[PDB]
């Protein structure tokens, strides 16, 4: 019951086992700042250089990183006609440009990948995952990422900032608890997929709708109850950057709409099989959390919460 595990138990567990420690997050941010400072310095000496900006872009920049972070997400804005429009070529272009701006590193440290270029340092901290963004001068650092997908890292970061401002600490913490749970489900369940961004937008919609995030068991239950009862068939649109009129008609089963790009459906790829998996998992987790609320002993309460958070949870 709550005597055995309550909101403060979950909050302690999140710090001990879920959240990225501040010390480590500082280290990663300084790593990215180092590259960014080098790029700014090189850009200053060579205004015609293609790489115009490097922006931390992922969970670390949004304050939603988990202890299991394995690289630092950054976006690099690329301008000019020389840059290719094919991902293999563009990543090659990005790599060569990164090599030019970083003369202290050897060429082999900068290695391209399928969707990004990775900057790795041997034996000294995490790698830097760089995603190219084609830039043509649109406002708010809008750019395109096999067609071109428009995006703005600053606006994406702004969107999350507003929700964190609405519920300081609690929003980012619940997002991390839900992501931590989703990661456990993927290793335990085969067809299970749940994009981190969808989790973030679903929870942002709940926060906008007035759900209270200051009690983590109940906030998670609102999240799980939403998934089960809407069955991911309720369209999620935010009016931060455009009115809901802009979306138009969609044929997609799940509709969770990019708050920066009204034409991008984040859940576009998700099938009915993916949905049934999320729903089943959410029902099980909701069943476990309510079981823990009434469980007569600490041992049963912990065992129920371990259905949600895994063996690392000990109450």
């Amino acid at each position: 019951s709550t005597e055995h595990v309550d909101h403060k138990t979950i909050a302690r567990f999140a710090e001990d086992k879920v959240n990225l420690p501040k010390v480590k997050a500082d280290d990663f941010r300084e790593q990215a700042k180092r590259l960014q400072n080098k790029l700014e310095g090189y850009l200053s000496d060579h205004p015609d250089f293609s790489l115009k900006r490097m922006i931390p872009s992922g969970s670390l920049a949004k304050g939603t990183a988990l202890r299991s972070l394995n690289d630092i997400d950054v976006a690099v804005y690329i301008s000019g006609s020389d840059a290719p429009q094919d991902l293999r070529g563009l990543l090659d272009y990005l790599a060569d440009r990164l090599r030019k701006a970083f003369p202290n590193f050897s060429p082999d440290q900068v290695k391209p990948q399928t969707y990004s270029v990775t900057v790795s340092f041997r034996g000294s901290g995490l790698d830097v995952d760089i995603v190219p963004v084609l830039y043509s001068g649109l406002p708010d650092w809008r750019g395109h990422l096999g067609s071109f997908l428009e995006t703005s890292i600053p606006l994406h970061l702004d969107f999350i900032k507003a929700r964190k401002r609405a519920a300081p600490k609690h929003f980012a913490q619940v997002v991390r608890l839900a992501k931590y749970w989703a990661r456990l489900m993927k290793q335990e369940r085969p067809n299970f997929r749940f994009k981190s961004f969808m989790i973030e937008l679903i929870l942002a919609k709940l926060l906008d709708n007035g759900v209270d995030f200051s009690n983590y068991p109940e906030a998670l239950q609102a999240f799980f109850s939403y998934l089960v009862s809407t069955e991911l068939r309720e369209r999620i649109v935010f009016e931060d950057n455009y009115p809901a009129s802009k979306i138009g008609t969609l044929s997609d089963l799940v509709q969770i709409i990019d708050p920066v790009n009204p034409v991008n459906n984040v859940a576009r790829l998700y099938t009915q099989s993916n949905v049934d998996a999320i729903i089943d998992a959410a029902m099980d987790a909701g069943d476990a959390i309510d079981a823990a609320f009434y469980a007569p002993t600490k041992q049963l309460t912990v065992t129920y919460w371990q259905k949600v958070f895994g063996s690392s949870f000990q109450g």
């Binding site: 109850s225 009862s229 069955e231 029902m283 309510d290 079981a291 609320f293 009434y294 007569p296 129920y304």
Partner: protein
């Protein structure tokens, strides 16, 4: 060749004495099921669930519970969702399932929430004095009423077990 029985070594202890701790273990799982019903159908309330749990503990401890149903009822007939718990002896390995698996998204517009209890033979055979001592702590008292019917079928989907005893759960299911 094709006639089998449960393995002898797989049987659990058959000489268990049912205590209040076993009662609380079963009643906590019912409370959970009731809270799951509330999340998807709005009833019963947290305070009612707490009183149902107290009631269940008292009757289970005394051995006076035969069967109890909670859920939505139209006319005199249960509809989905309705959870029914029948007390019985623990069999075999003694299945002790986790609570949960309430079906969401069912239409309950016309019905109101109710609960209905049937007492056991031990209760009916008990003296008045035995009843008074065993049931002092009841959170409320029940009044007789006509036994309700079922609009749908019953699915036997969970068993809760403790102290040599089991609670068998059937869930009412709509015809589809």
């Amino acid at each position: 060749s094709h006639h089998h029985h449960h393995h002898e070594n797989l049987y659990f202890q058959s000489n268990a004495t049912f205590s209040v701790t076993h009662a609380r273990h079963m009643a906590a799982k019912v409370a959970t099921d009731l809270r799951r019903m509330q999340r998807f159908y709005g009833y019963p309330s947290d305070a009612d669930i707490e009183a149902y749990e107290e009631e269940l503990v008292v009757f289970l401890k005394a051995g006076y519970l035969g069967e109890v149903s909670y859920g939505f009822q139209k006319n005199n007939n249960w509809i989905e969702p309705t959870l029914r718990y029948t007390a019985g002896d623990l069999l075999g390995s003694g299945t002790d399932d986790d609570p949960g698996k309430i079906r969401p998204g069912k239409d309950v517009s016309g019905a109101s929430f109710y609960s209905f209890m049937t007492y056991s033979s031990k209760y009916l055979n008990a003296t008045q004095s035995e009843k008074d001592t065993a049931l002092k702590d009841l959170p409320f008292k029940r009044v007789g009423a006509q036994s309700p019917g079922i609009n749908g079928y019953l699915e036997n989907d969970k068993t809760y077990s403790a102290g040599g005893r089991s609670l068998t759960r059937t869930s009412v299911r709509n015809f589809v």
